[PDB]
Amino acid sequence: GSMVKSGKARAHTNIALIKYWGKADETYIIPMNNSLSVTLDRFYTETKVTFDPDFTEDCLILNGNEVNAKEKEKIQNYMNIVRDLAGNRLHARIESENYVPTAAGLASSASAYAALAAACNEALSLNLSDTDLSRLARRGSGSASRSIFGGFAEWEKGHDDLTSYAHGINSNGWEKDLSMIFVVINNQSKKSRSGMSLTRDTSRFYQYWLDHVDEDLNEAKEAVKNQDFQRLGEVIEANGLRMHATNLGAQPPFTYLVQESYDAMAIVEQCRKANLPCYFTMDAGPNVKVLVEKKNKQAVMEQFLKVFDESKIIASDIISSGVEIIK
């Protein structure tokens, strides 16, 4: 229509190699430390927003379905940020499709909020910089800040809303040579922000995390500058494990990992011993993610396919480009 402003964006999920875990500020989503991720080619969210003066409230339709009273409230609060930023009072119909294996445990929050932020920027012609786009995404989900970018990306922690945001890291095309295999681990179906908060606030091992994160980050970044896969893998695997260690120290303790997760880790180590370099990481759940060079992707997958169902071994390459405006 004449008075109608719409925009549509595709943004890809990302997986943190140096973990985001713990917030300095719950309201504005400011983290305790910097994080480093890779953006996945295979998994993404497409989101259209349509702002119409006649709309009375924001509507969200997800994968063709209404969301419910609760998720509807969360989205309306986020859109208030957008309206304020834009200096208007328009409401939007949001139609989003996740092309992310969510039932298999993969998170869609990073792609979702990045897609939405970009979609709004397009619909309203805000001409936001990548930095400001990153800051807007961050308000929805911290990891979404990084999904504005392709390849390697880093979320700079900052100290406030203006200074906390992400940027893309140029790696001389190295991202084109890397892959990530997702091992879908059998998990309970019972109902990440709550856990992170409990650990950050109460964990007896949280200081240990803080004492090593910057060192890990620098080492990781040095490894990327050298395209040194083993140096990257060793530090990110250790960093990932330290993050899980912090949960063990929470009051009371908890874990995201199950025995099956440890089985998958054992297979990665076996691959390293059989001259197939690869390294694992885990987030707020038992799924195991395996960083591997693209040339070795298939051979590592086959080692997994000996133990696990074919449907549970899902690989993705790493995409070079960032968030995109689509039809």
Place this chain on the structure above:
Amino acid sequence: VKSGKARAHTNIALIKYWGKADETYIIPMNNSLSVTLDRFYTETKVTFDPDFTEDCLILNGNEVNAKEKEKIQNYMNIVRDLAGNRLHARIESENYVPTAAGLASSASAYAALAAACNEALSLNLSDTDLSRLARRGSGSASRSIFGGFAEWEKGHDDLTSYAHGINSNGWEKDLSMIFVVINNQSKKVGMSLTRDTSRFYQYWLDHVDEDLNEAKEAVKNQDFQRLGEVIEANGLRMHATNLGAQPPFTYLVQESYDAMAIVEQCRKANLPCYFTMDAGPNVKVLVEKKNKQAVMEQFLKVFDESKIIASDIISSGVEIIK
């Protein structure tokens, strides 16, 4: 024929033994602190007969696995060497523990065997040397020579590595331990792997001496909360080391964490108690006698009666039978 019989009780480490400096003589990377338990024990009769060609172990009325025989035969060589004879022995041990519940018996088994041999061969070993003898079979056995609180001093060789009993002016008579029996998901079955390969092991080493000092200070002052907090943190740091092993592993399962959550709730409800876990998923809850029944009731809301088993802390140490 020469024979003797002895009873030794299990002990639970509050400051963990985790990692060896020397595998051959079982010298640890750090000191450990434990409490000895009233309810769980091993009784062992040993009989040295010149007739016997090889050492025989019969446990709970049944022969032991091939691997255990080899262990016993090696351990018995140490005894023969210390005694200065060439006698083989039939060993008849009985473990008094809940069946198939995952409770360890190596500490009580070897402490009972060492004392049984001490008696049979009339060595009149001092407590120190009896503890030394027990250590060669199993590190924790060094501590079961004693009751109440006991500390294993790591030393630096065979002569200097041993345990002693800690006098807490009877404080142990005021304390108890509730076991929460939990099982894993494996139909069929770490310290070395973790000591040798864990990326977080230095973290353990950096804090253990401090924990130990804080723990010993608490005992001296009979300060339950202070003891509890440091031992709980220490036990968790031990399990953290396993997460950094190459490749990582865990002794814990979700039900273990379920039990830990109950302890924390008890603390919030004016029922001070603290947990620790060893090389398995069972959760052990230290609690003062006055609060044992109340804390048990809280567990009974979630866990089955058959899976909650309490023990007092015994004051006396290893003991000759007859």
